[PDB]
A paper describes a structure:
Depletion of GapR gene in Caulobacter cells results in severe defects in cell growth, cell division, cell size, DNA replication, chromosome segregation/condensation and gene expression. Our current studies clearly demonstrate that free GapR is a tetramer, but not a dimer.
Interestingly, during our crystallization of GapR/10A sample, we also got a crystal which produced a dimeric structure of the Caulobacter GapR protein only, without the detection of any diffraction from DNA. A comparison of this GapR dimer structure with that of the dimer-unit from the open tetramer complex revealed that the backbone heavy atom RMSD for residues 16–65 is 0.32 Å, while residues 66–89 show larger deviations for both protomers. SAXS analysis results indicated that the experimental Rg value of the free Caulobacter GapR in solution is 28.6 Å, much larger than the calculated Rg (22.8 Å) based on this GapR dimer structure. Comparison of the calculated scattering curves from the GapR dimer structure and the experimental SAXS data of the free GapR shows a fitting χ2 value of 21.9, indicating the solution structure of free GapR can not be like this dimer structure. Analysis of the GapR dimer structure, it is apparent that the hydrophobic areas (residues 78–87) on the second α-helices are fully exposed, while the same hydrophobic areas in the closed tetramer participate in the formation of the tetrameric interface. It is possible that the dimer structure can not stably exist alone due to hydrophobic aggregation, when the C-terminal hydrophobic areas are fully exposed due to the disruption of the tetrameric interfaces for GapRΔC3, GapRD68A and GapRY82A mutants. }{}$$\begin{equation*}\ R{{\rm g}_{{\rm app}}} = \sqrt {\left( {{C_{\rm A}}Rg_{\rm A}^2 + {C_{\rm B}}Rg_{\rm B}^2} \right)/\left( {{C_{\rm A}} + {C_{\rm B}}} \right)} \end{equation*}$$\end{document} where CA and CB are the mass concentration of the major and minor conformers with radii of gyration of RgA and RgB, respectively. If the minor conformer is a dimer, then its radius gyration RgB (22.8 Å) is even smaller than RgA (26.9 Å) of the major conformer (closed tetramer), which can only result in a Rgapp that is smaller than RgA based on the above equation.
Numbering used by the authors:
A (entry chain A), B (entry chain A): 11 to 87
Write the structure that this text describes.
Amino acid sequence: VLNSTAQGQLKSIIERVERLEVEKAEIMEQIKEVYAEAKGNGFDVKVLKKVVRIRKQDRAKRQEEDAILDLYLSAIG
Amino acid sequence: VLNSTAQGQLKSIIERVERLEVEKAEIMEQIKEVYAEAKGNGFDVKVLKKVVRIRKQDRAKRQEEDAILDLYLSAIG
């Protein structure tokens, strides 16, 4: 059995996660809409998605290079 | 070569998709934070996630039952 406080906690957890998952689905739908718009303008959607992935990978690489920089500087001092 | 209007279109597409993908990542992080909070309260996160999936499946089932209802009613009229 779950006591009163725990039942409240559970209900709050489910409520918040479900609201966030609705927002996430809304965002995903908007991304789909932007790509559909692009397709309408004559763009290649598969290639656009690849452009986005490549740029994401570049940003990730730069962040890890910042981490590595802090590691080296730390080690040197 | 891409003409002026097409270059503007491309830049707008990438800009909007990347902003939306940042929002999506923010939402995913918030979901993680809610589950971390739940774990702190003594809840089983794996089981919570399963609760959320089950409820999502129930909602999906109800939507498809509404679709099927419209199909049957349509066919009958």
